[PDB]
Design a binder for this molecule. Structure first.
Ligand SMILES: N=C(N)c1ccc2nc(-c3cc(CC(=O)N[C@@H](CC(=O)O)C(=O)O)cc(-c4cc(S(N)(=O)=O)ccc4O)c3O)[nH]c2c1
Ligand SMILES: [Zn+2]
Length: 258
């Protein structure tokens, strides 16, 4: 009876195995654009993905992860609210059964069709496992998806999903350039929060881009053909793998832009 997004194991039940689900810095949150304050001391964000080395794509039963080689300082996030250097380890998405829901963060209560999470860990803790035990251990760059024009840089991801339909399947996924998933502008909101899946650890500085990327209806329809279940198990479409917005509590959301 493992956690998930179904009628009996979804986010309302997580607190029973992971009591930090009711904690002081949980994610995602609603971003109230009229309450977020412009912070002119935020530095420009530095996204350095030219040497990023993708390795593999895995259906983990909750999402799919595109995994990177993080054994050296290649693909790094720095600047903005961050102190020091954060190394790219994986990206994944959260998405809906229909275009009107799917994102984890919301903007003035607007839900986007999906949300990309590029996950980075703070190199001063030496490995990912140590980093998640620290309040400043991870930096997650969140990017909204809306349905419109295709994203050309996403199609190589869409075209491998058929080969990782079910839980536990993986495929070689080398030479993928995550620069192709970014919007034009790096304007962002930031706040301290958590992983949005169990174990819900409170180790994340969230950096949420204001500008969504456009993907096509055909591209997200292929996400929604994935399965939560393992091979030879009853088919459960991988849809609605998002956690809803959590209380803000004693937190401020800061904007990088006027
Ligand atoms: N590249 C590798 N060698 C490697 C090895 C192990 C790894 N474990 C994870 C991982 C696990 C986890 C969970 C974790 O802590 N432990 C797991 C498994 C376990 O340790 O028993 C669990 O309890 O389910 C989360 C993330 C991750 C998830 C999100 S979100 N939006 O909440 O889905 C955001 C950022 C995240 O970092 C993970 O990245 N990423 C890993 C990468
Ligand atoms: Zn995520």
């Amino acid at each position: 009876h493992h956690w998930g997004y179904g009628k009996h194991n979804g986010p309302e039940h997580w607190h029973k195995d992971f009591p930090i689900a009711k904690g002081e810095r949980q994610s995602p949150v609603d971003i109230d654009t009229h309450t977020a304050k412009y912070d002119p001391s935020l530095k420009p964000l530095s996204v350095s993905y030219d040497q990023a080395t993708s390795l593999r794509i895995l259906n983990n039963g909750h999402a799919f992860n595109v995994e990177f080689d993080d054994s050296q300082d290649k693909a790094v996030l720095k600047g903005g609210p961050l102190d020091g250097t954060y190394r790219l380890i994986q990206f994944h998405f959260h998405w809906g059964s229909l275009d009107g829901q799917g994102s984890e963060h919301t903007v003035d209560k607007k839900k986007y069709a999906a949300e990309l999470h590029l996950v980075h860990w703070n190199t001063k803790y030496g490995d990912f496992g140590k980093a998640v035990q620290q309040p400043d251990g991870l930096a997650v760059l969140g990017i909204f998806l809306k349905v419109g024009s295709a994203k050309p840089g996403l199609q190589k991801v869409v075209d491998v999903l058929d080969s990782i339909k079910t839980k536990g399947k993986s495929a070689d996924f080398t030479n993928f350039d995550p620069r192709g998933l970014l919007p034009e502008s790096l304007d962002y909101w930031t706040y301290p929060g958590s992983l949005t899946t169990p174990p819900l650890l409170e180790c994340v500085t969230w950096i949420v881009l204001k500008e969504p990327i456009s993907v096509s209806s055909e591209q997200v329809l292929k996400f929604r053909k994935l399965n939560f279940n393992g091979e030879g198990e009853p088919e459960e479409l991988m849809v609605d793998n998002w956690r809803p917005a959590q209380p803000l509590k004693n937190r401020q959301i800061k904007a990088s832009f006027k």
